[PDB]
C-alpha cells in the first residue's frame, strides 16, 4: 500500500512547489493519476485477501472505499477551486494540503491490518476535517459545528481505545488477520455488554446512528464543498468499515445487543426521511438524506448476513457518489444565488437545462432507480432484513416511498415551476461544474454494468 | 377584501362579482345555449328585482343570503377557461417564458447570429438606464410621507420621460413564446 | 365607473412601449445569420447491420454456452414424423363418433 | 393553429358582438361609446358585455379589470395587452 501512500505524500511538495497559477491543475492531474493507479487493488481472490505487508492489506471491502477515496480528491479540488479563487496563495495551499492529508489518512485507515493503527488513522481523520470546516466554512455556525463534530466522535471513540487495548491484552494481538483465526465467542455478561458498546458506539456516531446524528446536519452544512464531499462520501463509511471489522469479535452477543440499535435505525430511516420532507435548507435536506441512507447500512451490519454485508458495501459506495453529487449540485446553485434556502431559486430548468439533467439523474440515483448500485444495495438490504423479520418490509417500503417523495420534491422545488423573477445572476453552467457532475455520475452508472467489484469480501 | 388599488370591496362590486359567478356556474349547470339563455334571463330578473334598493342593511342581507343561495347551488366542477387559473392549460407555457436578461449571458458567437436584434436591444437597455434615475426621483417626489397608501403607480408627466417602473412590465415575455 | 385618468394615461404609455418592444422582437430578413456549414440506408444501417451483429453474437457466444438460449421443445401430435429419428407417431384411437 | 389577432380584427369582433346586443343600437355604436354615459347601460349590462367578450375570445377577464372596461376601445386595448398583438 506504500505505492499509494508515497505519491499522496509527494502531492505535498507538488502543491507547495507549484507555480501560483498551477497549484490546482498539478494537484488535479496527479491525483487523477493516483486514482488511475488505485485500480491495481482489484487483484482480489475468492479465498484470500490481498495481504501486502505486516501493516497493510486490502480485502474486497476496503478496495472500493479506497478507489472512491482516491477518486474523490480531484473532484474536491475541482469543486473547491472556484469559491477559494480569491483566497491567499498560502491559505489555498493549506486547504489543498488538508485535503491531501485527509486522503493520506484515509487510504491507510482502510488498509490498516492492525486495529489500533486503524484507530490512530481513524481519529487522525478528524483534524484535517475539523480544520477545513472551522477555517473555510462560510457562516458563523462552523465553529459550533466543528465542536459537535469533534466531541461526538471523541466521546464515542475514547471508550473504543480502551476496548481495543483490552483486546490487545487478552487476545495478544489486534491484527485482523490473526483475529480471523483466534476469535473467541463473546458470551452474555455485563462486562461483554459494555465491551460491545465500547467497540460499537464510535462507529454508531460516525455512521451516524439516529439520535446521535446531531453533529451531521451542522458539520455537513457548515463545511465548504470539499468538506461536504469528503464527509458525505468517505467519513460516514469509516463507521461502517469499522463495524464490519469489529463485529467479527462480538459474537454471539451481537445477536441480542443489536435490537435497540436496529430499532433506532429502522425508525430513524423513517424519521430522517420525514425530516427531509420539511427542510428549507437544501444542504440540510441532503444531510438528513445521508442519515436516512446510512441507517440501512447500520441495520445491514447489525443483522450480519452475507446479503446484508453485500448490500451495505454497495450502498456505501453508491451513497458516497450520490451524496457527493447532490452536495455539488447544491453548491452549483449556492455559487449563483448565495443562499442555501431551497425555495429561493426556483424554475432552474428553464435556465440551466443540462444542469437540470444532472439534478434529474442524481435524484433518480437518490431514489434507488434500478439497475443502479443504489438500488442494488437498497434491494439486498431489504432482502436480508426481510429474512431477519418479515415485518421490516413495512418500514423499508415506507422509507422507499418517503425517499422517492423527498428526492422528487427536491427536484421539483429547485428545478420546476416558474423561475424566481428578482434573481438575475443565474450564470450558465461552467465547464468545471458540468465536468464535476459527470465525474460523479458516470462512474456511478458504469458500476451498474459490472457491479461485482463493489459487493465486498463475500460476493 | 384583497385588491391592488382599493383596500376593500364595495357592496356594488360584491353584487357584480356574485352576478358573474352565478352566471358562470349556471352556464356550467345549463350546458345548452338556449336553456342557459332562458335561465340567465330569469337570473337577470332576480337581480333586477332588488336592484333599486336604497337600504344598505337590507341590500347587505340580501347579498349575504344570495351568497348562501349560490353556495348551495354551485356546480362542483364549473367551467374554467383553459388559461384561467384552475384550467387545463393554465400556466402551461411558463416553462417557455425565459426572462429578458438571459440574452445578456449569451456567447458572442450566438449574438453574432442575430446582429440587428442585439443592436436594437442595446438601445432599449440604454433607454432604460437613462430613464431609471428620473423615474426614481419622480416616485420619491410624488409619494407622500409614510410610504404609498395604494399600490397604484403614477404615470409619466413630462415628455421624454418614461413611466416609472416600466421595464418588467414592457419586457415581460409573451404568452406563446 | 372605470379607470382614473392617471391609470388610462399609464396604460396608454405602457401600451405604446410594449408594442414597440414586441415590434422590435421581430426578426430581420437576414437573421439568423448562420456560420458556414442512399435511399434505403435505414434498412441497412438499422436492421441489416444489427441482425448481423446480434446473429454473430448469439451464434458464436450465446449458444456456445449452456442453457443460455433454451427453447421449448416442439409440439408433437399423433400423425407426425420426427426429423431426427424418422419415427412416425401412431395416430389416435378411432373416435366414438358423436354427430 | 391559432391565427394571430390584429387590433383591426379584435376591434371588428368586439363591435360585432356589441352590435348583436339588443340594448345597443348599431348605428350609435363606436369605439369610444361609453356604456353608461353614452349607451346608458347598467352595470349588470357591463358584466354581461365582459362575459360575452370572454365567450368571444376564449379567456377570462378578471373582475378588477372587468369593472373598469367601460368603452369598447378599453376592451380592445385590454385584449391587446393580454394577447400581445402587433408583435
Amino acid at each position: 500500500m506504500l505505492k499509494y501512500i508515497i505519491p499522496t505524500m509527494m502531492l505535498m511538495p507538488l502543491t507547495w512547489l507549484s507555480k501560483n497559477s498551477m497549484i490546482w491543475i498539478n494537484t488535479t492531474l496527479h491525483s487523477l493519476l493516483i486514482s488511475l493507479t488505485s485500480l491495481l487493488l482489484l487483484n482480489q481472490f475468492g479465498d484470500n485477501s490481498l495481504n501486502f505487508s505486516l501493516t497493510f492489506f486490502s480485502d474486497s471491502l476496503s478496495t472500493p472505499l479506497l478507489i472512491l477515496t482516491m477518486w474523490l480528491l480531484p473532484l474536491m479540488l475541482m469543486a473547491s477551486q472556484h469559491h477559494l479563487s480569491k483566497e491567499n496563495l498560502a491559505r489555498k495551499k493549506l486547504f489543498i494540503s488538508m485535503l491531501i492529508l485527509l486522503q493520506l489518512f484515509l487510504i491507510m485507515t482502510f488498509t490498516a491490518t492492525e486495529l489500533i493503527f486503524f484507530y490512530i488513522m481513524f481519529e487522525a481523520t478528524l483534524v484535517p476535517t475539523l480544520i477545513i470546516i472551522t477555517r473555510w466554512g462560510n457562516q458563523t455556525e462552523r465553529l459550533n459545528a466543528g465542536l459537535y463534530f469533534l466531541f461526538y466522535t471523541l466521546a464515542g471513540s475514547l471508550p473504543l481505545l480502551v476496548a481495543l487495548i483490552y483486546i490487545q491484552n487478552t487476545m495478544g494481538s489486534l491484527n485482523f488477520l490473526i483475529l480471523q483465526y483466534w476469535v473467541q465467542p463473546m458470551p452474555n455478561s455485563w462486562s461483554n455488554t459494555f465491551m460491545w458498546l465500547a467497540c460499537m458506539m464510535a462507529f454508531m456516531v460516525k455512521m451516524p446512528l439516529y439520535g446521535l446524528h446531531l453533529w451531521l446536519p451542522k458539520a455537513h452544512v457548515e463545511a465548504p464543498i470539499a468538506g461536504s464531499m469528503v464527509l458525505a462520501a468517505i467519513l460516514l463509511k469509516l463507521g461502517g468499515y469499522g463495524m464490519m471489522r469489529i463485529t467479527l469479535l462480538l459474537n454471539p452477543i451481537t445477536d441480542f445487543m443489536a435490537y435497540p440499535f436496529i430499532m433506532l435505525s429502522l425508525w430513524g430511516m423513517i424519521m430522517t426521511s420525514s425530516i427531509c420532507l420539511r427542510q428549507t435548507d437544501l444542504k440540510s435536506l441532503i444531510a438528513y438524506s445521508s442519515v436516512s441512507h446510512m441507517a440501512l447500512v447500520i441495520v445491514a451490519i447489525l443483522i450480519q448476513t452475507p446479503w446484508s454485508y453485500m448490500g451495505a458495501t454497495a450502498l456505501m459506495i453508491a451513497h458516497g457518489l450520490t451524496s457527493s453529487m447532490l452536495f455539488c449540485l447544491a453548491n452549483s446553485n449556492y455559487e449563483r444565488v448565495h443562499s442555501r434556502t431551497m425555495i429561493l431559486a426556483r424554475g432552474l430548468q428553464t435556465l440551466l437545462p443540462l444542469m437540470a439533467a444532472w439534478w434529474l439523474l442524481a435524484s433518480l440515483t437518490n431514489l434507488a432507480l434500478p439497475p443502479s448500485i443504489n438500488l442494488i444495495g437498497e434491494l439486498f438490504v431489504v432482502m436480508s432484513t426481510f429474512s431477519w423479520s418479515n415485518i421490516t418490509i413495512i418500514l423499508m417500503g415506507l422509507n422507499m416511498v418517503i425517499t422517492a417523495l423527498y428526492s422528487l420534491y427536491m427536484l421539483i422545488t429547485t428545478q420546476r415551476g416558474k423561475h424566481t423573477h428578482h434573481i438575475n445572476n443565474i450564470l450558465p453552467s461552467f465547464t468545471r461544474e458540468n465536468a464535476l457532475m459527470s465525474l460523479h455520475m458516470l462512474p456511478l452508472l458504469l458500476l451498474s454494468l459490472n457491479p461485482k467489484i463493489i459487493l465486498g469480501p463475500l460476493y | 377584501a384583497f385588491l391592488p388599488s382599493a383596500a376593500y370591496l364595495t357592496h356594488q362590486q360584491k353584487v357584480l362579482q356574485l352576478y358573474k359567478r352565478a352566471l358562470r356556474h349556471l352556464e356550467s349547470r345549463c350546458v345548452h345555449r338556449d336553456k342557459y339563455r332562458y335561465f340567465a334571463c330569469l337570473l337577470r330578473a332576480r337581480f333586477d328585482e332588488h336592484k333599486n334598493e336604497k337600504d344598505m342593511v337590507k341590500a347587505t342581507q340580501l347579498l349575504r343570503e344570495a351568497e348562501k343561495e349560490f353556495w348551495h347551488g354551485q356546480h362542483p366542477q364549473p367551467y374554467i377557461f383553459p388559461e384561467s387559473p384552475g384550467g387545463t392549460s393554465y400556466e402551461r407555457y411558463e416553462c417557455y417564458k425565459v426572462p429578458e436578461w438571459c440574452l445578456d449571458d449569451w456567447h458572442p458567437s450566438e449574438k453574432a447570429m442575430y446582429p440587428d436584434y442585439f443592436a436594437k436591444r442595446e438601445q432599449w437597455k440604454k433607454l432604460r438606464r437613462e430613464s431609471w434615475e428620473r423615474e426614481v426621483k419622480q416616485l420619491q417626489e410624488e409619494t407622500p410621507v409614510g410610504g404609498p397608501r395604494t399600490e397604484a403607480l403614477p404615470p409619466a408627466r413630462k415628455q421624454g420621460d418614461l413611466p416609472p417602473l416600466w421595464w418588467h412590465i414592457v419586457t415581460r415575455p409573451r404568452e406563446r413564446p | 365607473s372605470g379607470y382614473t385618468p392617471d391609470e388610462k394615461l399609464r396604460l396608454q404609455q405602457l401600451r405604446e412601449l410594449r408594442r414597440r418592444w414586441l415590434k422590435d422582437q421581430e426578426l430581420s430578413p437576414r437573421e439568423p445569420v448562420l456560420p458556414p456549414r442512399r435511399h434505403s440506408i435505414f434498412a441497412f444501417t438499422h436492421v441489416l447491420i444489427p441482425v448481423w451483429i446480434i446473429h454473430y453474437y448469439l451464434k458464436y457466444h450465446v449458444t456456445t454456452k449452456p442453457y443460455t438460449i433454451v427453447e421449448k421443445k416442439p409440439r408433437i401430435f399423433p400423425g407426425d414424423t420426427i426429423l431426427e429419428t424418422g419415427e412416425v407417431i401412431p395416430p389416435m384411437k378411432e373416435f366414438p363418433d358423436q354427430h | 393553429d391559432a391565427p394571430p389577432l390584429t387590433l383591426e380584427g379584435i376591434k371588428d369582433r368586439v363591435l360585432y358582438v356589441l352590435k348583436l346586443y339588443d340594448k345597443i343600437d348599431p348605428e350609435k355604436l363606436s369605439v369610444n361609446s361609453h356604456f353608461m354615459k353614452d349607451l346608458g347601460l347598467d352595470s349588470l349590462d357591463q358584466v354581461e358585455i365582459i362575459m360575452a367578450m370572454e365567450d368571444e375570445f376564449g379567456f377570462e377577464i378578471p373582475d378588477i379589470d372587468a369593472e373598469k372596461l367601460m368603452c369598447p376601445q378599453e376592451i380592445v386595448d385590454y385584449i391587446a395587452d393580454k394577447k400581445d398583438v402587433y408583435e
Binding site: 435556465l351 | 438571459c102 449571458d105 458567437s109 450566438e110 | - | 408583435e87
Partner: peptide
Amino acid sequence: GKRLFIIKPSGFY
C-alpha cells in the same frame, strides 16, 4: 414571415 425572436437561455456552454 413575421418570425419572432425566441428568448431562451444560453445554449452555447
